[PDB]
């Protein structure tokens, strides 16, 4: 599958199976050296960000190519597959190892192999089922937010509620405002004061409980494996349902099936299929990462605790009150009943192959498959609900279609010209096609739950244009790959290929890529035998690779319609253009070494690598005088230097007692080398990062200095002057900070002990050098603006003349985005803890139906050592806003074998 | 294997072959203009004037502008494929207007010289579409000059900028990255674009939905006024001021029905096309409106100081239409000029608070003639047209003497982004920290001090350039010190 000289990490069944999250790349965080996965949303429906050996580019995606059994499929389609059907994941991290893939093999390739049936005699059926709950994994953010009358006090004394007002005068007003607002809705007018207290200065409303819940994860699975002769079958049906812990509704449930089949027909032909499909329902909390008054983790920190979204029995009301409001405000469950949403995905995955063997040595393999996704989605705005703007209802139905076919057939000749010269030649063809399409229609004006067909809407000023979007791409490629092996100690691999992408114009869509590599078996040639060294191999590779992950239509210089009236068509210029836009051309030098110690009970593999991206696809920002936002261009350059090492070994004391550990590490230094427009630096506006030629993608802010004890004013260091401070902030006080945005250290470790059926596994993961701006704290910590929102208990201490010994400033001045928000988002995470117990062997003899059973208790994400003050340190890149934190899971599970 | 893929709903850019291709592109220009010369876009400079205080409801949207939070106004705004808002937005929409008016003006001039048209009737209309494109360029460059070039009255500035205009680009060139043109360049491009267009456009306006000679006369008079050229503004004033009559209202309800009707306002010289299903937008920043069934409720984020309310006589029809005593149900006034045009309501019965983009109305021309006439010693026609404008509004003015001009203008142009410019030329400091708030609104509209004072000539009466344009173009000289 991959080269003897390429950097290759392979992950096992166990790291992939039985995971209470549908994003299996999370299950790899800290398992492959140099592979940096990070899931920035606990939203069930979110997908991780894998990056092998750094960020490959400043504009094209750096996501690895994903391959399942030969066919490139999106993380979205992998999510609908049953990962209990996965035999192994293999990560390919250098140009030698990724030489027969296209589209974007410059980012490494993740190859997922589904299980085939073991050529057994009885053939094994196996049954799994598990239940568990999701929670939030950090509570510390609200340990020090002001309490109810603590915040009332702060405001009144701050003059926010007017000058010369007492605390009771103010609460007289807020309770006044809830009484007259609620008094206008038949559904509330004589429930306020009986069952509803939206305003309550004697109890602090638990705003965490308002917007977050404990939620369940449920999954089950049966799978018949076996076969016997030249034929093999692996079939499975399965179920999965993960509900999202945000009370803002979000979920991922899938109903799964798969059938894998291979059969030798005769001494020349072997055919086989792997078939997979699923009915899937996903929904996502779409308000997260924005700042909306009473939602998300921002809500749970900023809502004044004298505001009660609950009723009198502790249950969640339909609606809460905020002073000034003209409408009562729907709570998260009642918003959901009033804004219903569903979506069915029918997912099809058909893949065949033929393996003709005409004469000794050559293997012709032809493979093809489709990857169809028809998705049907419905959305309403329920009529007659009195907390809406109108009593009239709306409904929006959309239908989606993704069909991606790909054929990829090969001819391979292996021969030998001696006992010491092994040769392998293989070349192949591959056509990749994608056809996508999105259609949607909507109506409004409904006045009945039961009369809400789209075709029954009002017609006049209530009619709408449909929604319509199409997108297709295509790839044509020819590749070759050779293998020379002398005396079984020296091995060389060479490769040439040409890729052609629909995403570039006719005169620039082709590009040639090559690779050379050698593995040298130092052990078996220069050291026949050693009393402690078991295996020693030296690998080394150079090669070039293509990267094409960009839009589908990003070169043409185009017009779109922009109608001015209703009787004539109008036309505006749509896109800037780049007739010369073409492949990004990446380059990899990789020097590796693998070593085996003792009696292959101790392995190591170190790899040094130099990743070069020339012709880099940058979506260059354009000055606004141009009247555009962007235009992709092959502009600029970048470097990724680093090392990754991984090692593992076994520690018995009793043989019937296994202790086994594993470690995983990468360091990676990044260097932008060439930008655009002769620029040496480009700071990316209102992002706090900067591209500057000398250094890597870095943060860029003013150094906050603290406060002037004389005035209470905030001070920032003035860069370059002597250290010089100032009370006058200006944008020209900003400077590049020696902290990187892509976190430079990726690693993990995992332990294991097994006594006799009882075993404990723990997997850890870390990401050090991470930094993030805590956009949340821009709100919770200032005393110059947003005086409605709950604040941090540190503002009760703010400098005034009589309290002149603090580092928290006087009230009335807003904070700038300086280093006071740059938090150290490094974290170690305990990715999963599993205690499992496989029932004894002698418990089953005598009942010839069951052959074994296993029970396990399990936790995901329980330990999070980190300095970050905002729930999840993983939930972000450069900034961290209203986050949906990753979840903490407790799961108990069962397995049956017949 | 043909692996060209071409995007659906897109066509390739080509030069104009037919007259029908030209007309279709002129519309896209006018569509663009409609989300550009848009009242949403001028609220930022409306709120930065001395007229407003923030309420407890605001979520720091209008505060940077009302309380002069210079740390926020520096980078203020956005301009990507998610949101076009704020200062960055105001900048970006006018540049696209200019760039796209570039490729229209230049491609019509090319087609004419390549004689592609099928008769002289097309040729004559396309030479006239050409003048329209010219006015749009002058507006685009002037609106960019209104906000990113300094007045002659400013004191401290970054070294070099006191004489700079905006980046003048007369060609459709997306890749262009040049330096700032001078003041006299930008204003000579604006005035000559307009002069070259006023020659060609016909005396009588053909459509209130497109550029006309009457419009360019007015827009030019607006520009002269803000240039201090008082005599020259009064001459373009007189060319159109008598062709558009004032709203004939007996009470404030006949006034509100007429003024709020895009279709029936006899004062509208040039507006953007609007239907309920195309070209209507909600502009509920000033007023805080939201529908409630058959009604309208308000939760504003900023409200006038008392002195604004006290500007209006009680019998002024604008005092229940331009501003409206509907804050806290009936306790204080808000700016309600952009409340709704009912004609854009999906259902007659139910408000959706949608309006259209108006571009010039004869009320402004009355106030440009009146101010200019006072400066050039022409009292007879200075008082004729100011008493005319205020008597139509139900509160005819006592004495006519410039002091009187400032109030009446402030009243009529409220909400339209006009007051901040008026205080620069009238040499008024901000004085926001000392204005009384509306008493009826105590506890909802409180006083908030300036985060930075704004005395006469403060550099921040002019916006800084967007940080996108500064970071991508080291040859751009900044407005603010240091």
């Amino acid at each position: 599958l991959s080269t003897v000289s390429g950097s290759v990490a392979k992950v096992s069944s166990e790291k992939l199976a039985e995971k209470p999250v549908a994003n299996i790349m999370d299950a790899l965080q800290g398992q492959v050296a140099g592979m940096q996965v990070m899931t920035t949303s606990g939203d069930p429906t979110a997908v991780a960000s894998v990056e092998i050996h750094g960020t490959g580019s400043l504009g094209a995606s750096s996501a690895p190519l994903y391959i399942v059994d030969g066919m490139q499929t999106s993380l979205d389609v992998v999510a609908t597959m049953n990962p209990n059907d996965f035999e192994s994941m293999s990560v390919l991290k250098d140009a030698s190892a990724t030489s027969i893939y296209g589209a974007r093999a410059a980012n490494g390739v993740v190859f997922i192999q589904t299980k085939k049936g073991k050529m057994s005699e009885r053939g094994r059926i196996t049954f799994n089922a598990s239940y568990g709950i999701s929670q939030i994994l950090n509570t510390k953010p609200l340990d020090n937010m002001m309490t109810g009358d603590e915040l009332l006090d702060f405001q009144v004394k701050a003059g926010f509620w007017g000058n010369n007002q007492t605390v009771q005068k103010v609460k007289d007003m807020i309770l006044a405002g809830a009484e007259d607002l609620y008094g206008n809705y038949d559904s509330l007018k004589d429930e306020y004061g009986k069952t509803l207290f939206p305003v309550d200065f004697n109890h602090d409303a638990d705003w965490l409980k308002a917007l977050f819940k404990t939620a369940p994860t449920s999954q089950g699975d049966i799978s018949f494996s076996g076969g016997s002769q030249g034929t093999s079958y692996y079939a499975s049906i399965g179920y999965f349902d993960q509900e999202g812990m945000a009370r803002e509704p979000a979920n991922f449930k899938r109903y799964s099936g798969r059938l894998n089949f291979e059969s030798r027909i005769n001494e020349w032909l072997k055919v086989g299929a792997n078939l997979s499909g699923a009915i899937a329902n996903r929904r996502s909390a779409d308000y997260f990462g924005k700042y909306y008054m009473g939602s998300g983790t921002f809500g749970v920190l900023t809502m004044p605790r004298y505001y009660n979204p609950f009723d009198v029995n502790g249950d969640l009301a339909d609606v809460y009150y905020m002073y000034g409001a003209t409408r009562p405000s729907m709570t998260e469950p009642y918003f959901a009943k009033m804004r219903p949403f569903s979506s069915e995905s029918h997912q099809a995955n058909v893949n065949g192959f033929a393996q003709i063997t005409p004469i000794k040595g050559l293997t012709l393999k032809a493979q093809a498959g489709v990857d169809i996704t028809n998705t049907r989605t419905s959305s309403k705005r329920m009529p007659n609900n009195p907390y809406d703007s109108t009593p009239l209802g709306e409904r929006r139905e959309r239908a989606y279609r993704d069909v991606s076919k790909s054929f990829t057939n090969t001819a391979e000749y292996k021969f030998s010209i001696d006992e010491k010269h092994d040769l392998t030649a293989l070349m192949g063809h591959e056509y990749i096609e994608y056809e996508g399409d999105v259609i949607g229609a909507s109506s409004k004006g409904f006045e009945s739950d039961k009369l809400m067909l789209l075709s029954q809407g009002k017609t006049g000023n209530s009619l709408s244009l449909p929604e319509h979007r199409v997108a297709e791409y295509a790839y044509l490629s020819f590749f070759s790959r050779f293998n020379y092996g002398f005396d079984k100690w020296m091995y060389i691999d060479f490769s040439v290929r040409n890729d052609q992408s629909s995403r570039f114009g006719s005169n620039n869509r082709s590009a040639w890529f090559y690779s050379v590599g050698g593995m040298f078996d130092i052990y078996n040639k220069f050291i026949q035998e050693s009393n402690w060294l078991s295996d020693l191999r030296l690998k080394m590779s150079y090669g070039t690779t293509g990267n094409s992950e960009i839009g589908n239509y990003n070169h043409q210089a185009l017009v779109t319609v922009n109608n001015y009236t209703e009787d004539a068509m109008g036309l505006s210029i749509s896109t800037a253009g780049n007739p010369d836009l073409s492949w990004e051309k990446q380059s990899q030098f990789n020097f590796g070494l693998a070593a085996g110690a003792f009696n292959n009970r101790l392995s190591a593999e170190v790899d040094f690598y130099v990743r070069t991206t020339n012709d880099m696809l940058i979506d260059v920002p354009m000055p606004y005088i141009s009247g555009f936002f962007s235009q992709y261009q092959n502009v600029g350059s970048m470097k990724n230097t680093g090392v990754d090492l991984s090692l593992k070994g076994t520690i018995y004391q009793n043989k019937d007692w296994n202790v086994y550990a594993s470690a995983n590490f990468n360091y990676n230094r990044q260097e932008i080398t060439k930008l655009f427009f002769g620029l040496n630096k480009y700071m990316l506006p209102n992002t706090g990062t900067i591209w500057e030629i000398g250094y890597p993608n870095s943060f860029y802010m003013a150094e906050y200095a603290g406060i002037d004890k004389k005035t209470g004013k905030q001070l920032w260091y003035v860069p370059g002057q002597v250290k010089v401070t100032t009370s006058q902030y200006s944008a020209d006080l900003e400077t590049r900070i020696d902290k990187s945005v892509t976190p430079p250290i990726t690693g993990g470790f995992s332990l294991g002990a097994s006594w006799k059926g009882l075993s404990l596994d723990a997997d850890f993961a870390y990401i050090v050098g991470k930094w993030m701006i805590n956009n949340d704290r821009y709100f919770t910590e200032n005393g110059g603006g947003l005086m409605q929102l709950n604040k941090d208990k540190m503002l009760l201490n703010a400098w005034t003349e009589d309290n002149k010994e603090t580092d928290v400033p006087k009230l009335g001045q807003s904070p700038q985005f300086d280093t006071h928000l740059l938090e150290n988002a490094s974290f170690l995470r305990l990715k999963n803890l599993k205690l499992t117990y496989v029932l004894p062997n002698s418990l089953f003899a005598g009942q010839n139906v069951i052959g074994g059973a296993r029970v396990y208790l399990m936790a995901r994400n329980l330990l999070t050592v980190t300095k970050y003050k905002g729930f999840d340190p993983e939930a972000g890149g450069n900034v961290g806003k209203n986050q949906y934190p990753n979840s903490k899971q407790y799961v108990a599970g069962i397995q049956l074998s017949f | 294997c043909e692996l060209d893929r071409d995007p659906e709903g897109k066509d390739f850019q080509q030069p104009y072959t037919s007259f029908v291709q030209t007309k279709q592109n002129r519309d896209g220009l006018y569509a663009l203009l409609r989300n550009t010369e848009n009242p949403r876009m001028h609220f930022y400079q409306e709120l930065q004037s001395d007229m407003y205080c923030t309420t407890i409801t605001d979520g720091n949207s209008l505060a940077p502008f009302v309380n002069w939070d210079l740390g926020i106004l520096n980078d203020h705004g956005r301009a990507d494929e998610d949101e076009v808002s704020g200062i960055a937005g105001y900048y970006f929409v006018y540049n696209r207007l200019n760039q796209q008016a570039n490729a229209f003006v230049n491609n019509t001039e090319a087609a004419l010289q390549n004689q592609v048209y099928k008769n002289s009737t097309e040729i004559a209309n396309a030479k006239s579409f050409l003048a329209e494109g010219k006015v749009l360029q002058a507006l685009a460059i002037w609106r960019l000059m209104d906000r990113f070039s300094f007045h002659e009255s400013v004191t401290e500035v970054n070294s070099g900028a006191k004489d700079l205009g905006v980046i003048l680009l007369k060609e459709y060139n997306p890749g262009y990255i040049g330096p700032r043109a001078t003041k006299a360049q930008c204003y000579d491009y604006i005035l000559s674009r307009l002069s070259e267009a006023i020659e060609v456009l016909p005396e009588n306006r053909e459509s209130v939905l497109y550029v006309s000679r009457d419009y360019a006369y007015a827009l030019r008079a607006r520009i002269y006024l803000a240039l201090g050229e008082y005599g020259k503004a009064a001459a373009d004033a007189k060319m159109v001021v008598d062709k558009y009559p004032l709203i004939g209202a007996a009470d404030a309800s006949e006034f509100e029905n007429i003024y709020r009707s895009d279709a029936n306002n006899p004062e509208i010289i040039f507006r953007g096309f609007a239907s309920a299903t195309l070209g209507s937008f909600t502009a509920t920043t000033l007023n805080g409106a939201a529908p409630a069934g058959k009604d309208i409720k308000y939760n504003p984020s900023a409200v006038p100081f008392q002195w604004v309310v006290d500007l209006y006589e009680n019998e002024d029809f604008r005092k229940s239409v331009y501003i409206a005593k509907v804050v806290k149900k009936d306790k204080g006034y808000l700016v309600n000029k952009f409340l709704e045009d009912k004609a854009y309501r999906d259902v007659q019965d139910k408000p959706n608070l949608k309006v259209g983009a108006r571009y010039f109305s004869v009320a402004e021309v009355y106030l440009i003639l009146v101010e200019s006439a006072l400066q050039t010693g022409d009292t007879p026609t200075a008082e004729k047209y100011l008493k005319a404008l205020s008597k139509a509004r139900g509160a005819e003015v006592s004495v006519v003497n410039m002091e009187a001009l400032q109030a009446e203008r402030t009243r009529e142009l409220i909400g339209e982004g006009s007051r901040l410019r008026d205080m620069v030329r009238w040499s008024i400091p901000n004085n926001h920290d000392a204005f009384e708030t509306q008493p009826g609104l105590e506890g909802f509209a409180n006083t908030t001090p300036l985060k930075a004072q704004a005395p006469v000539g403060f550099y921040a009466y002019t916006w800084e350039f967007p940080q996108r344009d500064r970071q991508t173009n080291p040859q751009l000289i900044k407005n603010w010190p240091i």
Binding site: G289, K290, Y291, Y292, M293, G294, T302, M322, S329, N686, T687, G688, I773, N775, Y778, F779, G785, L786, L789, F817, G876, G877, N878, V879, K881 | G59, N60, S61, I72, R78
Partner: peptide, 10 residues
């Protein structure tokens, strides 16, 4: 009801 305050974008 959103609080723009400041949205340092990602």
């Amino acid at each position: 009801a959103s609080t723009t305050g400041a949205n340092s974008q990602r």
